C-alpha cells in the first residue's frame, strides 16, 4: 500500500552526478590509456555488468585504481560514464563504433541494443 | 543532441537497493536508538539535506558510524531509508506523525510535503 514519488530516481541520479562533478565521495579512478576518470564504485556497478563483477570480487572491491583494456577508447568511455550518471547518451556518427565496443566491454546491454539499432538504420 | 533511456534512473536505483539488501559496498551505519541501519553515504546525501551536510563536512565525511538525535523513531527512519532506495513511501495512519518528524529532521522536503497533505485531508 505504498505511495510513489515519480521523480525520485531521476532526482537521486542528478544529485549523484552533482557529487561526481564536484569530486565528492568518489572512491575509484578508472584509467583508460593516458586518461583518468573519477567515479563512485556503486554507480559504476549499478550501470555495468563489468564493474558489477569487478567490485563484488573480494580482492578488486578494495582497489582505488582500475585499468581498462588498452583497446578501450577514452572518448567512448567518457560518453558512457556521462550516460551512467545522466541517462543521456551522446551517440554520433563519428563515435557510434567506439561507444558500441566500449558498451559491449562494460556489459551495458541497453546501450549495445540502441547502437546496433542505429548502425542497422544507416 | 543526446538520446535518453527513460528507465535508466529507476534501474540504477533498483540496483543500488539490491547492493543495500546484500550489504555490498555499504560504508556507513546509521544508529537510531538501539537500531542500526547500513547504507551508502552517496545515496543518503542524494536523498537528504541532513546527510548531504554531514558527509560534505571535512571531518564527518570520514565517519563509519552516525548517531541520530534520540527523539528519532527507528521505524520512521526505516520507512524513509526504504523510500530513499525505492521511491516508495509506506505512509500509514499509525506512522505518518513519526515519518513527517523524521523527514523534517532528515530534510526530505517532498516527503514532508506529502505528509502535510495527507494529515490536512484527515
Amino acid at each position: 500500500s505504498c505511495i510513489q514519488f515519480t521523480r525520485h530516481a531521476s532526482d537521486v541520479l542528478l544529485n549523484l552526478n552533482r557529487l561526481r562533478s564536484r569530486d565528492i565521495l568518489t572512491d575509484v579512478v578508472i584509467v583508460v590509456s593516458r586518461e583518468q576518470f573519477r567515479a563512485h564504485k556503486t554507480v559504476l556497478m549499478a550501470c555495468s555488468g563489468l564493474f558489477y563483477s569487478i567490485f563484488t570480487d573480494q580482492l578488486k572491491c578494495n582497489l582505488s585504481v582500475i585499468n581498462l583494456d588498452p583497446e578501450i577508447n577514452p572518448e567512448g568511455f567518457c560518453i558512457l560514464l556521462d550516460f551512467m550518471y545522466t541517462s543521456r547518451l551522446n551517440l554520433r556518427e563519428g563515435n557510434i563504433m567506439a561507444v558500441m565496443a566500449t558498451a559491449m566491454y562494460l556489459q551495458m546491454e541497453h546501450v549495445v541494443d540502441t547502437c546496433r539499432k542505429f548502425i542497422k538504420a544507416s | 543532441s543526446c538520446i535518453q533511456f527513460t528507465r535508466h534512473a529507476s534501474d540504477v536505483l533498483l540496483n543500488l537497493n539490491r547492493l543495500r539488501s546484500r550489504d555490498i559496498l555499504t560504508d556507513v551505519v546509521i544508529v537510531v536508538s538501539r537500531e542500526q541501519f547500513r547504507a551508502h553515504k552517496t545515496v543518503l546525501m542524494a536523498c537528504s539535506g541532513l546527510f548531504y551536510s554531514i558527509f560534505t563536512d571535512q571531518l564527518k565525511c570520514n565517519l563509519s558510524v552516525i548517531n541520530l538525535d534520540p527523539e528519532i523513531n527507528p521505524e520512521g527512519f526505516c520507512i524513509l531509508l526504504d523510500f530513499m532506495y525505492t521511491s516508495r513511501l509506506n505512509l500509514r495512519e499509525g506512522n505518518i506523525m513519526a515519518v513527517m518528524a523524521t523527514a523534517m529532521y532528515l530534510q526530505m522536503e517532498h516527503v514532508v510535503d506529502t505528509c502535510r497533505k495527507f494529515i490536512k485531508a484527515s
Partner: peptide, 4 residues
C-alpha cells in the same frame, strides 16, 4: 506522488 502516485499509486504505483
Amino acid at each position: 506522488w502516485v499509486i504505483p
